[PDB]
UniProtKB/Swiss-Prot annotation:
Record-listed E.C. numbers: 3.8.1.5
Protein name: Haloalkane dehalogenase
Residue numbers annotated as active site: D124 (nucleophile), D260 (proton donor), H289 (proton acceptor)
Lineage of origin: Bacteria, Pseudomonadati, Pseudomonadota, Alphaproteobacteria, Hyphomicrobiales
InterPro entries, per the entry: AB_hydrolase_1 (IPR000073), AB_hydrolase_fold (IPR029058), Epox_hydrolase-like (IPR000639), Haloalkane_dehalogenase (IPR051340), Haloalkane_dehalogenase_1 (IPR023489)
UniProt gene name: dhlA
Length: 310
């Protein structure tokens, strides 16, 4: 039904610092015959569950440094790869990818696995999407760990969440340009540019999922989605705001990658205010858009702030 392709297993043979066994789901309601990859780490019977959501143009490999810390704290860690990324199947048409197709996969994943006591860990699109989930079933979510992300609302209700799109020229505009224009997109090169401390092994872990351009419709659509927000995205992100603001009564931990030219301080401070109970943020001076590449620290600190309330 949905036309898609699978990256060959051999492409991940040699991953650096990714000894996590794959778990797959190919029987999700609404995603018939579409195989979803997810990591399931730590005690599966854990009371607490860390749901790690990635963004553009990454995968669960991005949480590799955080997974072990949360796992060793006694928690179960779920880190799914969105359709189109990592080890999941990749629809070939850009048209197939929408906000709801990604948001509905997540709700379906959460129901199938029957996840409760969720500690939501988001960044980028893991955040644009992630942050609109608790409102569809608030009993499942207990805490939030938020890194450089925001809500895809309209330009009017939250200008701080729309302004980076146009300025600066070396922020979102250049990131976008890098992603949707080359006809030979090398993710390793793109990552080394946007996450400068990555080693060479690391960066190729990022290109692993896409042998050629036919595997990158999904990577190409995300950016266009931030730039051209559909009505359901807008309505949904807009309702989320209200949830964060009046209904959320969970524990929150915020971390900011201060060198981010996209979702920096100028986006995170105003998000901080919409989140009821949001403490003061952990500013990571050396971190850029991929705060997870400085994950150990963010994970230790967070479990640290959360335990000082149990």
């Amino acid at each position: 039904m949905i036309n898609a392709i699978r990256t060959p297993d051999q492409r991940f043979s040699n991953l650096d610092q990714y000894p996590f066994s794959p778990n797959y789901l190919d029987d999700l309601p609404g995603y018939p015959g579409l195989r979803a990859h997810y990591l399931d780490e730590g005690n599966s019977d854990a009371e607490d569950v860390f749901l790690c959501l990635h963004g553009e143009p990454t995968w669960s490999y991005l949480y590799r440094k955080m997974i072990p810390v949360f796992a060793e704290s006694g928690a179960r860690v779920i880190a799914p790869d969105f359709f189109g990324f990592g080890k999941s199947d990749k629809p070939v048409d850009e048209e197939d990818y929408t906000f709801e197709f990604h948001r509905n996969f997540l709700l379906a994943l959460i129901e199938r696995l029957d996840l409760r006591n969720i500690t939501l860990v988001v960044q980028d699109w893991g955040g644009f999407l992630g942050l609109t989930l608790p409102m569809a079933d608030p009993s499942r979510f207990k805490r939030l760990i938020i890194m450089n992300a925001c809500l895809m609302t309209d330009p009017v209700t939250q200008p701080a969440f729309s302004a980076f799109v146009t300025q600066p020229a070396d922020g979102f505009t250049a990131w976008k340009y890098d992603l949707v224009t080359p006809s030979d997109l090398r993710l390793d090169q793109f990552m080394k540019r946007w996450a400068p401390t990555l080693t060479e092994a690391e960066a190729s872990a990022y290109a692993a999922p896409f042998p050629d351009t036919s595997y990158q419709a999904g990577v190409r659509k995300f950016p266009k989605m931030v730039a051209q927000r559909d009505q359901a995205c807008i309505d949904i992100s807009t309702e989320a705001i209200s949830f964060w603001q009046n209904d959320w009564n969970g524990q929150t931990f915020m971390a900011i990658g201060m060198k981010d030219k996209l979702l920096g301080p100028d986006v995170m401070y105003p998000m901080k205010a919409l989140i009821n109970g949001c403490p003061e943020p952990l500013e990571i001076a050396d971190a850029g858009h991929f705060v997870q590449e400085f994950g150990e620290q963010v994970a230790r600190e967070a479990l640290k702030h959360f335990a000082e309330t149990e």
